[PDB]
Design an enzyme around this catalytic site. Structure first.
Site, PDB file in Angstrom:
ATOM      1  N   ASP C  78      -8.345  11.472  -5.849  1.00 15.40           N
ATOM      2  CA  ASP C  78      -6.660  11.726  -5.656  1.00 15.40           C
ATOM      3  C   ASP C  78      -6.025  11.799  -6.829  1.00 15.40           C
ATOM      4  OD1 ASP C  78      -4.374  11.949  -3.829  1.00 15.40           O
ATOM      5  OD2 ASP C  78      -3.888   9.750  -4.561  1.00 15.40           O
ATOM      6  N   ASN C 120      -0.396  -0.721  -6.067  1.00 12.72           N
ATOM      7  CA  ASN C 120      -0.735  -1.351  -4.632  1.00 12.72           C
ATOM      8  C   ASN C 120      -2.407  -1.115  -4.476  1.00 12.72           C
ATOM      9  OD1 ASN C 120      -0.332  -1.528  -1.887  1.00 12.72           O
ATOM     10  ND2 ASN C 120      -0.821   0.396  -1.577  1.00 12.72           N
ATOM     11  N   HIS C 121      -3.108  -0.191  -5.033  1.00 14.38           N
ATOM     12  CA  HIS C 121      -4.553   0.043  -4.571  1.00 14.38           C
ATOM     13  C   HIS C 121      -5.394   0.515  -5.825  1.00 14.38           C
ATOM     14  CE1 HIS C 121      -2.147   3.879  -4.043  1.00 14.38           C
ATOM     15  NE2 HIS C 121      -3.178   4.317  -4.735  1.00 14.38           N
ATOM     16  N   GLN C 186      -8.939   4.590  -1.057  1.00 13.97           N
ATOM     17  CA  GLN C 186      -8.121   3.722  -1.972  1.00 13.97           C
ATOM     18  C   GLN C 186      -7.578   2.590  -1.389  1.00 13.97           C
ATOM     19  OE1 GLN C 186      -6.115   8.193  -2.591  1.00 13.97           O
ATOM     20  NE2 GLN C 186      -5.141   6.431  -3.894  1.00 13.97           N
ATOM     21  N   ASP C 188      -6.156  -1.129  -0.410  1.00 15.79           N
ATOM     22  CA  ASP C 188      -5.187  -1.808  -0.848  1.00 15.79           C
ATOM     23  C   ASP C 188      -5.628  -3.272  -1.243  1.00 15.79           C
ATOM     24  OD1 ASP C 188      -3.152   0.189   0.047  1.00 15.79           O
ATOM     25  OD2 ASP C 188      -1.847  -1.326   0.855  1.00 15.79           O
ATOM     26  N   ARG C 216       5.255   3.179 -15.518  1.00 19.34           N
ATOM     27  CA  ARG C 216       6.129   3.390 -14.360  1.00 19.34           C
ATOM     28  C   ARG C 216       5.166   2.942 -13.189  1.00 19.34           C
ATOM     29  NH1 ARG C 216       7.456   8.337 -10.468  1.00 19.34           N
ATOM     30  NH2 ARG C 216       5.470   8.950 -10.341  1.00 19.34           N
ATOM     31  N   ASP C 218       3.563   2.533  -9.955  1.00 18.88           N
ATOM     32  CA  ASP C 218       3.417   3.361  -8.804  1.00 18.88           C
ATOM     33  C   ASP C 218       3.197   2.471  -7.429  1.00 18.88           C
ATOM     34  OD1 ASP C 218       4.257   5.653 -10.329  1.00 18.88           O
ATOM     35  OD2 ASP C 218       1.965   6.238 -10.617  1.00 18.88           O
ATOM     36  N   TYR C 222       4.632  -0.817  -1.442  1.00 17.62           N
ATOM     37  CA  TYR C 222       3.617  -1.149  -0.312  1.00 17.62           C
ATOM     38  C   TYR C 222       2.720  -2.461  -0.621  1.00 17.62           C
ATOM     39  CZ  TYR C 222       5.245   3.534   1.013  1.00 17.62           C
ATOM     40  OH  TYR C 222       6.035   4.517   1.448  1.00 17.62           O
ATOM     41  N   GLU C 260       8.608   3.689  -9.533  1.00 20.88           N
ATOM     42  CA  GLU C 260       8.411   4.940  -8.607  1.00 20.88           C
ATOM     43  C   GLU C 260       8.579   4.264  -7.208  1.00 20.88           C
ATOM     44  OE1 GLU C 260       5.118   5.620  -6.528  1.00 20.88           O
ATOM     45  OE2 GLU C 260       6.587   7.037  -5.397  1.00 20.88           O
ATOM     46  N   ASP C 330       7.960  13.796  -4.688  1.00 21.68           N
ATOM     47  CA  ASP C 330       7.446  12.874  -5.256  1.00 21.68           C
ATOM     48  C   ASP C 330       5.972  13.114  -5.391  1.00 21.68           C
ATOM     49  OD1 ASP C 330       6.071   9.763  -3.965  1.00 21.68           O
ATOM     50  OD2 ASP C 330       6.602  10.060  -6.098  1.00 21.68           O
TER      51      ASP C 330
END
Ligand SMILES: [Ca+2]
Ligand SMILES: [Ca+2]
EC number: 3.2.1.1
Lengths: 571, 280, 565
Positions: C78, C120-121, C186, C188, C216, C218, C222, C260, C330
């Site tokens: 990703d 987050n992940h 990915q 969490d 930043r 990201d 979440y 972000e 985004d």
């Protein structure tokens, strides 16, 4: 779903059960060839318009990759509806229009048809998950835990973590050899077998000439086995053959089986009956061997697989093409035990660079014209029916960065005009961009440019097909390797016997001498059996000195070749 | 300068017959001991832009104007690559003849990488564009703005500096530059080419021009195929019975020459260069 | 036992710039991919050392801070937003040492560097997740969110609803489901585990010790997941961010934390933190729907779609600063921000043919505006004069294009076009080796669009863009001044004033493609002399009567309001 007698059939060509053994196939993507509705996407009606070119080139049968309605998450190999052509290509009627137009000029059409799995968007699978007790609850392989069939490998081991995926609606696992959105059909259900046989019958009723049955080794799944090439799988294929022979004589069934030659011979069927499964299967490791043979400048990597290929049934015919990977799985066939070149490939820098990516003939050989000719010359003269890939006739390139399979699916380069003459649409709308580099770019590589000089690769390629079609020996003749003292030169003879009498370009013996070395090479051949015969070079109709008792000397340039017709002495 | 050689070689490949070459070689008078002929692969004299011809002594006199290819470039200097319609196999053949025929050869700059020309610049300027060194701005010829250049570089899809330049060809030994370089490397290894005798071997096939250069210390054999189709030639090399022909570009030994005619088979516009080596 | 990871001491710390806690409010950011900018090892892949070599260009352009997307070791399934190792830079870009070399070289010429850091992940290949699945009773068994059923947090939506069928995926080794908002590879991180919070704070501290200027953060909305909620913007999420801010303020003063958060302005204001303390979470967040509104405003030839979101943006804390850029999507989710209720342009966008064409695809400025030079200037002029700190995307200064067919995010990640030489002067490697091919079409091709070509004429877009940054840096009003919209009678002309208590500047922008007159009311600056900034030309002094300005199609003016003598 619809019926056949709601679209009217195309014209039927005269019934001939050996056409596929003499044919030269031309694999052409519908999306890529020509766009007639200025949407930026190649369509059936566009392909219809360009049939005159195809006729002129001299190919006998079109091979279309899957064009059925699909979400296209896996290049259209994930079929959503078997009875509906993808909207952007046209209607089923437009396909019949193509068929009729193609048959009118003696050109046949076959198509890829995935048998093992459908898309998860297919109505069947949506009915199976939503209505588990309905009539489609057993159309796919369901389970309560993902322990079943643990011997089976994950084909895409880098994308999928398991061959079982959990469906949230049905609250159960479903089996899939390929991607998680391509659930496997349950072929143990008798209704499933009948459903897929009706799919075959639909397109056969429309008047299609044959199919290439994709992913057939993975149909049936059994415990304690790798779920590949199981007896019940072959048993189903025998039904498909019977359905062809009984209902539509003179149609063909190609088997996409990406396995070693010694394994795929089982897909031709019981040899006692002379074949009762597929008519054709693909000899996959030929190209990798030919490639490495030219690399080594030694004939033996070609000789070896030709010697190690088992004999096939009488009806049967090998299919050969000039590519290193299977378009379905993007895997190069190899057997750790039976391939002696197993470790060799990864060590070669050229082979190593293109692992898992489809490449065209021209880039594969670094645009070397002399090589392009040699490889083409081998393809047309070696045993089995050859498949040309579209655009290779004009030496188009590829764009690797578009994807491992899309690389070879750019638009056909017709002219040096805007969008290479593929579409009128604005360049942004195109489904894929045309080649724009200094080497394979549409400004320098296109059909329009090559039509004029008879020295062009297009015209050269055209004429080679014209010569091949004049001698049956190439298509269905015997194959005897002549050997020779020089290891760099591969020489062999194709031969057809005098059926009830004649001495034409029919009942020929032909001699092919190929030089795999980049330097000029001499070869002393032993052609004593044809003593007194006069070799005649086919491209120029030039008579060479008659064959005698002493070894015959031929001298070739780097990557050169000769095609001689062995002609009788005059009574 | 032996001026009418190229026009004859050109028409010889057009006809696929050796004789227009044979004729002027036969009709060339002997020259003094110090003297040496100069030969190059062009049809016009850069001074007058006239192709040499003699109404009486040239038998091809009327023939040239009738040829469509010859007729198109009357009075204009053209490079080797455009003259042969960029046919790589031909470019090699004509170069191969230039280096193996009697007299000292002259290469024109840029022909080694197969540069083209721009005819519209003038009948003599056509072949005087800048040397194409790289695919960079101005073909790597100058740092100046493109407008300042004395003549513009080639910009068409075929002979353009984006696709035809020295930098590009330096890498693959299959390039025309590297091929041309090596042919000069081979020629410099045998004196026979430079100052050896010239005996035309003839042969039964009219499309194949075969001859031998000799110094009294190699004998070399050159077989050239003027036809675009593959051709066989049966040569009579009895005088070198027992000798072993060795192909020069690969150092490959061919079967030894015997009493019977020697058979060689060439591809379209192909050629071979053999060193005739003594038996041991 | 346990996950090894290196330490901050084991490498050189880069040179540290003088401590300044407002630099980010005055800065102009330059987002540049490491893989894309310059290749120095002829591997066909842009690298840290190459980016170091080209810092002189960056300096010359006049940008203040580099923003690098994720460059950590990754399987790159990703685009590198799936991190495999937080303490290792991806092999092809170089070593951690090479990053320090870049930092020191950049700081030497006053250029700061920030980086994307996914919170987050992590990738499923990360050592933690491999230890969590293989050793469930080990020290990493609770590092990720595990379950026995795919039933928990059913209110949370699937972000990638077309790729993922569920937010729970079954792991075969552990025989359990694991939570992931993004793709199935990915997983969490479990932020309820205190050890996880400490681990991620140590990741921040590592790069901050090396001397990086900020991050930043990201995918921060979440982080925490709670039952009976959509698992977005939960209080505990904000609470963790407050710790990160405290860790910055206490240990490394003068560093920055960008958020972000791809949400409507009224929601992201919470990520600046408690306004009583003047901010205690992030220093910056992105004002995401600005560009879509500016875009539609020029489409309609009406100022109001811009005016509306500027009016409906809530005030932010004193430390805080908005971040703005000229893109519609985004880069994380490839989603354009919109609120069905609070966005009045909600239905409007899909109906526009231009907007409809690029849904879900990153496009550059030049193609977005159909290569219209006058528009490119107008949009750039708005970016630099509107409130908040602007972010330029690499290559937009020379008006590069994109190749959409390479992928929805790769489209804007082709190589930087330096010269019209082979590979656009990006690499020495053979063209096949390049990570992505350069632009080759007749319009945005490297033969016609490159830095070398544009360096010469001062009329070029590069030189124009350079000078606009040079003007902006000469007036603080643009950076941290007040913003008062002047309105006017003509709906096609957007006029406003930036002010610091020490310039007042006036910006007049014409959104219509035809010439437009505007009568402005500048009575408050009666007697003042407007001076156009790009030419230092004095205009007639402002009086009591309405001031008339006439602009050409898509034109604009920047006046310095200068006192009478
Ligand atoms: Ca199956
Ligand atoms: Ca989370």
């Amino acid at each position: 779903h619809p019926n056949a007698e709601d679209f009217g059939h195309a014209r039927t060509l005269p019934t001939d059960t050996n056409w596929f053994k003499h044919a030269v196939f031309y694999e052409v993507l519908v999306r890529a060839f020509y766009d007639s509705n200025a949407d930026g996407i190649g369509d059936l009606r566009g392909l219809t318009e360009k049939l005159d070119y195809i006729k002129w080139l001299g190919v006998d049968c079109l091979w279309l990759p899957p064009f059925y309605d699909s979400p296209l998450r896996d290049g259209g190999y994930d079929i959503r509806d078997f009875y509906k052509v993808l909207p952007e290509f046209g209607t089923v009627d437009d396909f019949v229009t193509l068929l009729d137009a193609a048959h009118r000029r003696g050109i046949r059409i076959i198509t890829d048809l995935v048998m093992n799995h459908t898309s998860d968007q297919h109505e069947w699978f949506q009915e199976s998950r939503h209505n588990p007790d309905g009539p489609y609850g057993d159309f796919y392989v369901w389970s309560d835990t993902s322990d079943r069939y643990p011997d089976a490998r994950i084909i895409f081991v880098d994308t999928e973590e398991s061959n079982w995926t959990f469906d949230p609606v049905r609250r159960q696992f479903y089996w899939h050899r390929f991607f998680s959105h391509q659930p496997d059909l349950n072929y143990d259900n008798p209704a499933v077998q009948e459903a897929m046989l009706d799919v075959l019958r639909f397109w056969l009723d429309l008047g299609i000439d044959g199919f290439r049955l994709d992913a057939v080794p993975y149909l049936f799944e059994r415990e304690g086995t790798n779920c590949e090439n199981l007896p019940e799988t072959h048993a189903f294929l025998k039904r498909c053959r019977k359905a062809i022979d009984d209902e539509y004589p003179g149609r063909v069934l190609l088997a996409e089986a990406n396995q070693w030659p010694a394994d795929v011979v089982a897909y031709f069927g019981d040899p006692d009956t002379g074949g009762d499964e597929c008519h054709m299967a693909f000899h996959f490791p030929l190209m990798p061997r030919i490639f490495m043979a030219v690399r080594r400048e030694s004939r033996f990597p070609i000789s070896e697989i030709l010697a190690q290929t088992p004999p096939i049934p009488d009806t049967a015919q090998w299919g050969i093409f000039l590519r290193n990977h299977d378009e379905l799985t993007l895997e190069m066939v190899t057997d750790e035990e039976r391939d002696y070149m197993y470790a060799e490939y990864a060590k070669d820098p050229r082979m190593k660079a293109n692992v898992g990516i489809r490449r065209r003939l021209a880039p594969l050989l670094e645009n070397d014209r002399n090589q392009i000719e040699l490889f083409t010359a081998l393809l047309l003269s070696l045993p089995g029916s050859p498949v040309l890939y579209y655009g290779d006739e004009i030496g188009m390139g590829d764009i690797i960065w578009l994807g491992d399979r899309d690389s070879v699916r750019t638009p056909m380069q017709w002219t040096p005009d805007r969008n290479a003459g593929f579409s009128k649409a604005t360049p942004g709308r195109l489904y894929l961009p045309p080649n724009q580099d200094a080497v394979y770019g549409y400004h320098s590589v296109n059909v329009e440019a090559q039509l004029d000089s008879s020295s062009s690769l297009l015209n050269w390629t055209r004429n080679m097909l014209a010569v091949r079609s004049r001698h049956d020996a190439f298509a269905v003749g015997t194959f005897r390797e002549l050997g020779g003292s020089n290891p760099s030169v591969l020489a062999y003879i194709r031969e057809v016997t005098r059926q009830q009498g004649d001495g034409g370009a029919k009942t020929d013996a032909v001699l092919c001498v190929n030089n795999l070395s980049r330097f000029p090479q001499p070869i002393e051949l032993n052609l004593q059996q044809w003593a007194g015969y006069i070799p005649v070079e086919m491209t120029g109709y030039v008579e060479f000195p008659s064959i005698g008792q002493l070894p015959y000397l031929l001298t070739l340039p780097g990557h050169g070749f000769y095609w001689f017709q062995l002609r009788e002495p005059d009574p």
